[PDB]
Swiss-Prot record:
This is Ubiquitin-conjugating enzyme E2 13. It comes from the Eukaryota. The active site is at residue 85. Heterodimer with MMS2. Its EC number is 2.3.2.23. One of its GO terms (biological process) is protein K63-linked ubiquitination. The lineage of its organism: Eukaryota, Fungi, Dikarya, Ascomycota, Saccharomycotina. One of its GO terms (molecular function) is ATP binding. The gene is UBC13.
């Protein structure tokens, strides 16, 4: 039987959604969600909508949700496979946290890329030394890969 906690979190996600984010169980399985996050206003991502897949593993909430961008995105803290570099998704996760907590952090990360992070990918240098060019590329990629 499906854990009560998952039913309760899902209901809250669909009944009172966070601004800019949509989360809906993919088909009848409540462990698989399709999530969209609007590109933050005043960011290179402002003209698009980004799609992410989120999975609740069998040991959730003791294990963190698994999340990945489906949409290709040019950002220093999101790799080429759409994996997100945040501690809350790794070592700092705990049952005290909720799915909503993670989506809020991801949305904030889009608005505040951190190229100085020691784990940033190779676009980090471009973002730091040629920011106008880096932001322009991020806007072009939004046009090319994100939903309008």
């Amino acid at each position: 039987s499906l854990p009560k906690r998952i039913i309760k979190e899902t209901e809250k996600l669909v009944s009172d959604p966070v601004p800019g984010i949509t989360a809906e169980p993919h088909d009848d399985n409540l462990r698989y969600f399709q999530v969209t996050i609007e590109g933050p206003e005043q960011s290179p991502y402002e003209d698009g909508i980004f799609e992410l897949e989120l999975y609740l593993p069998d040991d959730y909430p003791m294990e963190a949700p698994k999340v990945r961008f489906l949409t290709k995105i040019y950002h220093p803290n999101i790799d080429r496979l759409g994996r997100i570099c945040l501690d809350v998704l790794k070592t700092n996760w705990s049952p005290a946290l909720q799915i909503r907590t993670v989506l809020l952090s991801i949305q904030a990360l889009l608005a505040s890329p951190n190229p100085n992070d020691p784990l940033a990918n190779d676009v980090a240098e471009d973002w730091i030394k040629n920011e106008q060019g880096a932001k322009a590329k991020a806007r072009e990629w939004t046009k090319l890969y994100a939903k309008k």
